[PDB]
Amino acid sequence: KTVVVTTILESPYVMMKKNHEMLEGNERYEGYCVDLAAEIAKHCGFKYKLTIVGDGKYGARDADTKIWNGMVGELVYGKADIAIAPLTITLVREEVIDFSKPFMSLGISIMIKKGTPIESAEDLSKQTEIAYGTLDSGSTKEFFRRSKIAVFDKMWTYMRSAEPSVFVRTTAEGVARVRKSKGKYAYLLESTMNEYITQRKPCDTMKVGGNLDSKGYGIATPKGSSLGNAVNLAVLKLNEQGLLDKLKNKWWRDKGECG
Numbered sequence: 144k145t146v147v148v149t150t151i152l153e154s155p156y157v158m159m160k161k162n163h164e165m166l167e168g169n170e171r172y173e174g175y176c177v178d179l180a181a182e183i184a185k186h187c188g189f190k191y192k193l194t195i196v197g198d199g200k201y202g203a204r205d206a207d208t209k210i211w212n213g214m215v216g217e218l219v220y221g222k223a224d225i226a227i228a229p230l231t232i233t234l235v236r237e238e239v240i241d242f243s244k245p246f247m248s249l250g251i252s253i254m255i256k257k258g259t260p261i262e263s264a265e266d267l268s269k270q271t272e273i274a275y276g277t278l279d280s281g282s283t284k285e286f287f288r289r290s291k292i293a294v295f296d297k298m299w300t301y302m303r304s305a306e307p308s309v310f311v312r313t314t315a316e317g318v319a320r321v322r323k324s325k326g327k328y329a330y331l332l333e334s335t336m337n338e339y340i341t342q343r344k345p346c347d348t349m350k351v352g353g354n355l356d357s358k359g360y361g362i363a364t365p366k367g368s369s370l371g372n373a374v375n376l377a378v379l380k381l382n383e384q385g386l387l388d389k390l391k392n393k394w395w396r397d398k399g400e401c402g
C-alpha cells in the first residue's frame with residue numbers, strides 16, 4: 144500500500160521545483176524533507192506519495208472547537224499516514240500523534256532587516272516602534288502564549304492585542320513583511336528557517352540574539368501506527384551514518400548566496 148506523506152511548502156524543506164506546472168507527482172517537489180522522505184521510505188520498505196497539507200498549516204488545536212488543523216490534523220483524522228516536515232515535537236502534539244526522535248535541532252530566533260536597532264527579545268519587548276509577530280497554528284505562537292518568562296509574556300501580551308494582526312499564515316509572509324516594512328517589523332521564527340533565509344538573496348535580513356529555547360523536529364505518525372517503530376530506527380541510522388548532516392549541508396551551506 145502506498146503511504147500518504149503529508150508535508151508543507153516551507154523552504155528549504157519542501158519547495159516547488161522551477162516550472163513545476165509541467166511536472167507530476169513526487170517529481171514536483173525538492174528540498175531537505177523531499178530527500179529525507181526518499182531515505183526513510185527506502186529504509187522502511189514503502190512506496191509513498193507526497194501531499195502538501197491542504198490548509199498550509201503545521202497544526203494546532205482550535206481553542207473553541209478542539210479540532211486539530213494542519214499536518215497534525217491530517218494524521219489525527221486519518222487523511223495521511225506520516226508527516227515528513229519541520230514539525231516540532233511538543234507535548235500537546237505527543238498527546239495525539241507519535242514522533243520519531245529528532246532529525247534536526249532548533250530554537251526560536253529573531254529575524255530583522257539589517258540595521259534594525261534590535262539585538263534581543265528583551266529589546267523587542269521594551270519598545271513599540273518596531274512591531275513583531277509569529278506564524279499562526281505553530282509551536283512558536285504556542286511558546287509565547289504559554290510562557291511564564293516575563294519578557295516573553297510581555298511579548299505575547301503585545302502580539303495578541305495588536306490590530307491589524309502581527310501574525311502571519313506562512314513563514315514567507317512574515318519574511319516579506321520584514322522586508323516591506325523597511326525593518327519596522329521583526330519576525331519570530333525557528334533558527335533553521337532563519338539561517339536558510341538570511342543566506343539567500345536579497346541579502347537584507349539577519350538573525351539576532353541567542354535562540355530562546357532548544358527543541359527538535361520529528362517524523363510524525365498517527366498514534367500507535369505500525370510505521371512508527373521502523374521510522375524511528377531509520378532516523379537514528381540516518382543520523383549516525385552522517386546522512387542528515389550531508390542533507391543539512393546540501394540545503395543550507397551549499398545554498399548560501401550572501402558570501
Ligand SMILES: N[C@@H](CCC(=O)O)C(=O)O
Pocket residue numbers: 201202229230231232278280281282283284331332333
Ligand atoms: N516547526 C513549527 C512551525 C514553525 C513555527 O511555529 O515557527 C511547528 O511545527 O509548529
